[PDB]
Design a protein around this motif. Sequence first.
Motif, PDB file in Angstrom:
ATOM      1  N   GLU A 108      44.678  25.227  32.794  1.00 21.04           N
ATOM      2  CA  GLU A 108      44.978  26.540  33.335  1.00 21.04           C
ATOM      3  C   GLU A 108      45.747  26.423  34.655  1.00 21.04           C
ATOM      4  O   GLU A 108      45.404  25.604  35.498  1.00 21.04           O
ATOM      5  N   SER A 109      46.797  27.225  34.828  1.00 19.88           N
ATOM      6  CA  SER A 109      47.561  27.177  36.074  1.00 19.88           C
ATOM      7  C   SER A 109      46.754  27.866  37.165  1.00 19.88           C
ATOM      8  O   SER A 109      45.886  28.693  36.885  1.00 19.88           O
ATOM      9  N   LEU A 110      47.036  27.523  38.413  1.00 25.23           N
ATOM     10  CA  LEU A 110      46.326  28.143  39.522  1.00 25.23           C
ATOM     11  C   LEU A 110      46.623  29.640  39.519  1.00 25.23           C
ATOM     12  O   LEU A 110      45.764  30.460  39.845  1.00 25.23           O
ATOM     13  N   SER A 111      47.851  29.991  39.149  1.00 24.35           N
ATOM     14  CA  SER A 111      48.256  31.392  39.098  1.00 24.35           C
ATOM     15  C   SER A 111      47.425  32.164  38.081  1.00 24.35           C
ATOM     16  O   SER A 111      46.994  33.285  38.348  1.00 24.35           O
ATOM     17  N   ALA A 112      47.207  31.564  36.912  1.00 23.97           N
ATOM     18  CA  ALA A 112      46.423  32.211  35.860  1.00 23.97           C
ATOM     19  C   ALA A 112      44.965  32.309  36.294  1.00 23.97           C
ATOM     20  O   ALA A 112      44.288  33.305  36.029  1.00 23.97           O
ATOM     21  N   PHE A 113      44.491  31.262  36.960  1.00 24.73           N
ATOM     22  CA  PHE A 113      43.122  31.207  37.464  1.00 24.73           C
ATOM     23  C   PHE A 113      42.909  32.343  38.471  1.00 24.73           C
ATOM     24  O   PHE A 113      41.935  33.096  38.384  1.00 24.73           O
ATOM     25  N   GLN A 114      43.829  32.484  39.419  1.00 22.10           N
ATOM     26  CA  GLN A 114      43.701  33.544  40.415  1.00 22.10           C
ATOM     27  C   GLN A 114      43.707  34.934  39.769  1.00 22.10           C
ATOM     28  O   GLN A 114      42.893  35.796  40.122  1.00 22.10           O
ATOM     29  N   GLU A 115      44.608  35.154  38.814  1.00 21.21           N
ATOM     30  CA  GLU A 115      44.681  36.457  38.147  1.00 21.21           C
ATOM     31  C   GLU A 115      43.361  36.744  37.450  1.00 21.21           C
ATOM     32  O   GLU A 115      42.856  37.868  37.469  1.00 21.21           O
ATOM     33  N   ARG A 116      42.813  35.710  36.824  1.00 19.73           N
ATOM     34  CA  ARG A 116      41.547  35.819  36.116  1.00 19.73           C
ATOM     35  C   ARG A 116      40.422  36.249  37.057  1.00 19.73           C
ATOM     36  O   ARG A 116      39.696  37.216  36.790  1.00 19.73           O
ATOM     37  N   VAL A 117      40.283  35.515  38.156  1.00 10.86           N
ATOM     38  CA  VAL A 117      39.248  35.771  39.145  1.00 10.86           C
ATOM     39  C   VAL A 117      39.404  37.137  39.802  1.00 10.86           C
ATOM     40  O   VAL A 117      38.459  37.923  39.848  1.00 10.86           O
ATOM     41  N   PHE A 118      40.597  37.422  40.310  1.00 14.60           N
ATOM     42  CA  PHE A 118      40.817  38.691  40.990  1.00 14.60           C
ATOM     43  C   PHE A 118      40.726  39.900  40.063  1.00 14.60           C
ATOM     44  O   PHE A 118      40.340  40.987  40.496  1.00 14.60           O
ATOM     45  N   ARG A 119      41.069  39.723  38.792  1.00  5.57           N
ATOM     46  CA  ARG A 119      40.965  40.823  37.837  1.00  5.57           C
ATOM     47  C   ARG A 119      39.481  41.142  37.651  1.00  5.57           C
ATOM     48  O   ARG A 119      39.078  42.308  37.587  1.00  5.57           O
ATOM     49  N   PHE A 120      38.673  40.092  37.564  1.00  6.57           N
ATOM     50  CA  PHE A 120      37.231  40.263  37.405  1.00  6.57           C
ATOM     51  C   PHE A 120      36.639  40.969  38.625  1.00  6.57           C
ATOM     52  O   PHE A 120      35.833  41.887  38.492  1.00  6.57           O
ATOM     53  N   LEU A 121      37.026  40.534  39.820  1.00  4.78           N
ATOM     54  CA  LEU A 121      36.499  41.154  41.035  1.00  4.78           C
ATOM     55  C   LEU A 121      36.892  42.626  41.119  1.00  4.78           C
ATOM     56  O   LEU A 121      36.097  43.463  41.551  1.00  4.78           O
ATOM     57  N   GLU A 122      38.118  42.934  40.702  1.00  4.71           N
ATOM     58  CA  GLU A 122      38.611  44.307  40.740  1.00  4.71           C
ATOM     59  C   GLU A 122      37.792  45.224  39.842  1.00  4.71           C
ATOM     60  O   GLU A 122      37.615  46.412  40.140  1.00  4.71           O
ATOM     61  N   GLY A 123      37.305  44.665  38.740  1.00  2.69           N
ATOM     62  CA  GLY A 123      36.525  45.438  37.789  1.00  2.69           C
ATOM     63  C   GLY A 123      35.111  45.780  38.220  1.00  2.69           C
ATOM     64  O   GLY A 123      34.488  46.675  37.646  1.00  2.69           O
TER      65      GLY A 123
END
Length: 171
Positions: A108-123
């Motif tokens: 997984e790219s760091l970019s994809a990892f960040q999107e994953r994490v931040f999307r979860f936090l946003e929810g």
Amino acid sequence: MELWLVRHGETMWNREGRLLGWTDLPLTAEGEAQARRLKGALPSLPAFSSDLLRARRTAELAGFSPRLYPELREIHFGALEGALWETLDPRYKEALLRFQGFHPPGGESLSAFQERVFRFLEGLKAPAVLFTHGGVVRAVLRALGEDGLVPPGSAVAVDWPRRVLVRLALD
């Protein structure tokens, strides 16, 4: 929004210095001791946890019964899973140290990892305690402009996405 993030207790790959992502290792005896020390030191908020064993167990030993979400997992290191940090190729080492442009083969790219994490936090719709991993806590702390390295079995509270509130380490 107030969020508490907990870095799971240590596993053998911590003392050995190997990249631990989706490899499902258990906590060491000390890792379990670190987790137990968190009981009574964290707020009684709804709990969510990475589904990986080390995170789930930390949550349980800390006195919680979290709902599991793979979105809270550590980054997938791909072919680099289990790699000794010490002998990592410079391109990968600098990428991880600078937390940028990291894309491991089969991972997984760091970019994809960040999107994953931040999307979860946003929810998240209310303050919660999140049992997760070093890389997740790091991504959050760095996004808030601070050094993101914290001890295994330690926690941080943040007012997402504005500022860090506290860092809590126990001995």
